[PDB]
Nucleic acid binder design. Sequence first.
DNA 1: AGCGTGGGAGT
DNA 2: TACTCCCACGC
Length: 88
Amino acid sequence: EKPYQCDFKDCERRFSRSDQLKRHQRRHTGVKPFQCKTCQRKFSRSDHLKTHTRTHTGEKPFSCRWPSCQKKFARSDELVRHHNMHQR
DNA sequence: AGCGTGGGAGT
DNA sequence: TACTCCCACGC
Ligand code: NA
Ligand SMILES: [Zn+2]
Ligand SMILES: [Zn+2]
Ligand SMILES: [Zn+2]
């Protein structure tokens, strides 16, 4: 199921796909290909750079679906937490 | 709350 | 492979 093993010392992680292993291995190497042009912070992943950028732009693409609630969020996981809050 | 950081997955 | 999206841990 997860044939791509991480061979770094004392790491037991295994992955379904080669690209998942490559991304994981950036944790060990510290290689960070992406940079925010606003604050120069570096990231190992482009999706992390994308959501970080919303800290500068104020974009909040995720709207609460509860009727009459107008709250918005920069990330889908913030909206999940918020929805969990409406539903006790 | 706000967000760095992470795996699992669709494409 | 890479880009993208989801949900999640932990502060
Ligand atoms: Na990418
Ligand atoms: Zn590893
Ligand atoms: Zn920045
Ligand atoms: Zn709401």
